[PDB]
Design a protein around this nucleic acid. Sequence first.
RNA 1: AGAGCAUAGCUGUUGGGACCCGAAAGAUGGUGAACCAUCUAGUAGCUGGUUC
RNA 2: AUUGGAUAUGCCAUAUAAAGCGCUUUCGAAGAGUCGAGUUGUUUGCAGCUCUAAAUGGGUGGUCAUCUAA
RNA 3: UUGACCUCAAAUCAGGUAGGACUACGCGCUGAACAAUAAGCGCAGGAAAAGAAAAUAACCAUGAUUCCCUCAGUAACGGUGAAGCGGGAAAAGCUCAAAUUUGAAAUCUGGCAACAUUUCUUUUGUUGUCCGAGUUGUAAUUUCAA
Lengths: 161, 75, 52, 116, 92, 166, 164, 198, 98
Amino acid sequence: ANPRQRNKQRSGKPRLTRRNANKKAKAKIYGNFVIQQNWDKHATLRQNYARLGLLATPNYVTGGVEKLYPDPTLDDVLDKEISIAPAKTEVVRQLEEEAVKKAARQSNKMLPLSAFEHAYIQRLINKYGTEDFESMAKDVKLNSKLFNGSKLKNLYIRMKA
Amino acid sequence: EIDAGYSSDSSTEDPYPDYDDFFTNTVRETPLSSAPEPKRRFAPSKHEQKRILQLAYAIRKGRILTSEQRAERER
Amino acid sequence: AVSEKAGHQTSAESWGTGRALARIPRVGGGGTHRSGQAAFGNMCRSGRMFAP
Amino acid sequence: YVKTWFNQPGRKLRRRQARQTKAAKIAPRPVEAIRPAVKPPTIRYNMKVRAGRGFTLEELKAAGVSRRVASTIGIPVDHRRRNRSEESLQRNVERIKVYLAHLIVFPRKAGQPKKG
Amino acid sequence: INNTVALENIYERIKYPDDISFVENQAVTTKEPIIIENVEDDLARELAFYKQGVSSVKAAFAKLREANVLISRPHDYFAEMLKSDDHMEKVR
Amino acid sequence: GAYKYLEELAKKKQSDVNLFLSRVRAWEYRQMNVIHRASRPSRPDKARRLGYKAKQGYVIYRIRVRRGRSARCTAEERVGRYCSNLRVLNSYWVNQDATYKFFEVILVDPSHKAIRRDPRINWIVNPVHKHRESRGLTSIGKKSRGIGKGHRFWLRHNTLSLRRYR
Amino acid sequence: LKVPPAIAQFQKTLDKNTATQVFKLLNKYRPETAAEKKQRLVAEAEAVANGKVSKKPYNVKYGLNHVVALIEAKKAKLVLIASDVDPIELVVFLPALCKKMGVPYAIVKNKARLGTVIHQKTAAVLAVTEVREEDKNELASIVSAVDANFSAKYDESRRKWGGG
Amino acid sequence: SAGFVPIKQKVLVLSSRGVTYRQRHLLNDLVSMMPHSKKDSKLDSKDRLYQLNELAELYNCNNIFFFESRRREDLYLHIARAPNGPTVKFHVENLHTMDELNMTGNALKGSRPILSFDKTFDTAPHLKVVKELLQQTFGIPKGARRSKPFIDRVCTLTIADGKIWFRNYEIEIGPRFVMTIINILEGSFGGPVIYKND
Amino acid sequence: APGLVVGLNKGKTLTKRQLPERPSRRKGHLSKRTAFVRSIVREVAGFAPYERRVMELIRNSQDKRARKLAKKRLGTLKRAKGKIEELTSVIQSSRLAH
RNA sequence: AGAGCAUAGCUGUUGGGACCCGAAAGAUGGUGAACCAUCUAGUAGCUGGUUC
RNA sequence: AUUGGAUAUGCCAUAUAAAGCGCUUUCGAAGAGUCGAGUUGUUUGCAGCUCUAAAUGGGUGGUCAUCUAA
RNA sequence: UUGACCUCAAAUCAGGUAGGACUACGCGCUGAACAAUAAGCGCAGGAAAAGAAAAUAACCAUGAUUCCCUCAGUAACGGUGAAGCGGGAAAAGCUCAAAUUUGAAAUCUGGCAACAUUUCUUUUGUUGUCCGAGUUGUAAUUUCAA
């Protein structure tokens, strides 16, 4: 009815039709590959999370839950240690197996020393030994950077390995 | 008592003085800030060491001309 | 539902009472056959249908 | 003006598609963050327990999670809330501790220069 | 709470001079108890207290006129009146 | 620092030093244009805390308005129209006299690369901040329309909301 | 017009002779230029790139926030205030702060001259905090001159409203 | 020194932050009827009311009229003898402003009213205290500014059903509102409680 | 399992905890440097015309008029009382120095 | 020794334009005292009409 | 064909660096013609006009609680 | 004097940017009649605005904003008419000013020269060098939760 919409009705030019209407189809999963392989495309995200043994919400659900078949003290809260949790599904075991193995691969946290770092700490040790780090930090001539005892201790530790 | 009277001020019945130093006449002997001195003021500057390592890197990569080879290019 | 302005898009006014015609407002202007044609009412052609 | 609710079933579908859209991006982690357990602030409701906004700093310190780590593993922090009693502290410390038990944190690759 | 002994001492301490006349002290209590006893009928009580107030006013006016200080307000004497422009318009 | 001394001196606005400078500069500003460029802010403490940085892309403009709507709101709008290519950041009071109130307005160039590459003022480049002073989004504009948090500060009550099942 | 004493004091500046002697000491302690700083750093870069511990630098202190913090810390031996700061209230407290902290101070002419010492267009205030052992007597003689030619002089004049 | 040209009774009228239109309406009224009162600005504090004694000494007013506002819904007028003395706290009910058309008691402004108090004030020793403080304040003493020698108004006071009626007459002067007693203290806006009305 | 049970109750037992002081509640506390800055500026800036008049009345022992003028200018009593005390110490320090 | 609660329909009633057609407008903003557009479905105790 | 976030892996990596946690015989800055007061208008907020601040201070609430504006 | 600095101008100088239109929704200003009313004027975006408490409360306390339901046709006011709590949708937090980098303006725009890169020969950067900005203060660090 609008003059702009009537204009394209009176024209011979076609509309910029875009066929995008696709309801009832759910978003496809990316991110985790393990979840993607075991994710079915028909079920809801609640049904898929429950099937894969995960939790969609760590809180309450603000409604009913579907029922398809009929069913057949501060010391002990602060000093306690919960014993993790079992994996109910092979997917959760697969997720857990990957996390531990990958963390083991990426575990080289200790660092070596560079040419300057090694010569720096080596010169301090040759004069003050290896146990007196407090007097090591107080020597202005050799400790030019004024590293404290804790930094010099970490330098020596990294040199040992 | 306050006698409920009036003090003749109720509504009912040097333009250019000299400078006065009432605070700066004396001299404060101690520093104003008691905060501890950081170690950065007794050690070589870490800002320059950042640039030195950055310059030393690009010297290895050939981004900056070294002083010896700067002169050769000039002549 | 019908449009929120159908039967009221035109402009008209009541010519008066006693002029040998119904006092329903008649579209003003000229040149078009709308001159004198009634609107803003269920009975009048191109008028507001009762209780849209 | 009269507000009509003909888009009521279309808002329901649109909101559900957002949950599915959100879950596709973040595949295995929960679609919501864990919320604390608090008590409403009236004599009419102080017996009830409901969900809060985030965990206090004193609750996170007891549980062993720092306030910078907490946001990265889906634990909200409420800098405003405080624990005026030991029951609120322990009720939500256990809530964090249970959450950490059921949590798998996938490792991240770290940049590691050659020396130094 | 309701310490009669303490209240009585306060009343005597702050009591106005009894020697001051009704016109002098600008206070003359009603001769009889106020007739405004109709709590529900406030309008009737307002008229009931009107008779008691006027009777006290009339009795005091005679007392006020006795000790000079003309009780009747002189119309010629244009003394300041608590009659605001809005208040006078609202009254009429 | 010196901004502690500058900002505590700005509280004694009728002291001997401040009164002499108020009257000397008010005469000077009246000889200039109604809206004139300022080489540097006359209150470097107040501009600095309102978001001004001494760098390219930050502009200070002075404007006088007649005394007798909000005076500061009109100064922001008039300067914004005068410099249509800049974004009004903030504004403040610098001076006044018996007739005029003098204000300085901080503007930011959304096209300068020193602004577009600075993440702390990068937000003003977005088109949603076009003429902030015109829509009451500045500090005085927000205050003018009573925006705030608390009991001290329509459409959803003049409408009938009819649900599907009612 | 009539000016307050705190602004009137800036019209009484240090004399030409003492100011010329002051800048002889200042010009010995100029900060190194952007070019000289780059040359020194690249020289140490080559000694690091190939293969390889100094003394504390010496220079004049500049910057309004920096100098005021040095006076409050009593680290400044001599503070030289520009006489023509465009907003005067930037340095209008400095003579009083220097009096309170016992810092020998002077008001010198041409803020541009102060900037030239530090390779800048303009400096509101310069401050000498601590100089080499060779210049201890030269700085001490300057501080005594500033006491006589600036503090002993004026003084009674700086408490009077100027102008008019 | 302490004062010159002494007046017997001098009041001090104030209000607290948040007073509504009707509360400040009556405050504008009571200032008009008694001219020996001083209208001051709002009081910043709400639990440091002992400063009203300092304010009173400043203006040499022996009576204080603090129209305190609580929750922006109720008015608690405090009447007190400024030097030591007792403090009485009345709640205001059934407001009647000057602007209302029922206002018909056109009396002479500043004219010394004749205050008539019912025996209900004399029934109890504490109600006698209320009568005395009400009498001294509302009654315009001789020698005050705006005072008039002619008498054109007569105040009639009565505690009916345990709650005071303000029935000042010229015909109703215009202020008709309840003065419900609450408590009375031994000091000026302070001191231990000696009366609870209940 | 992670899950919040909303409603009912959790426990009527109570044990009040002592809370520390938050940093925001520290606001208004005077600093050693801010007190120094204000003393320098107050002397440097001078005094307002109404502060000069108030200082004159205090010098002539007319404190009743001084407090009235301060309240008429500033607006409230506790602002007037604070200003009078500040200006009285200025006079006392001036007398000790001069 | 509690009879309510919810929905549907009927009827009555009060608001909305409120059974329909009807009474000079007024106001805002424009065009050349006038003209035009909108508020407007303005205001009706009254007029005429109101369907097997 | 154009793209997004991940995964795997090669190379590079200015780390003499940069962080979180922990502990204290050391420190800890917090926005003014604004707040506020009087008064006059618009619709309590806002606005004008006159005046104009403080530093455990100031705001809002019921001595206490809560908040930390410009 | 040379010469720096501050100004005041100029250039068909280089690189930019604003206007007008739409305006359903949005944010300001203004305003009659029969009410933030229509109009009138100003300004945006795909949403806008609001927004991480100078907020509620009086409890076993809550915890940015926004929207829905409820509170509620209630308190209050003089027929108008909320809000706290409560239930949902969604959730995310942060950045400056006020500190001496002072053992080193560590920061940035631009010109030029190379090297890349592209929704793109159309885009967007990197490195080097020089000039300018900047000490009347640009980075790092800090924002009270500390």
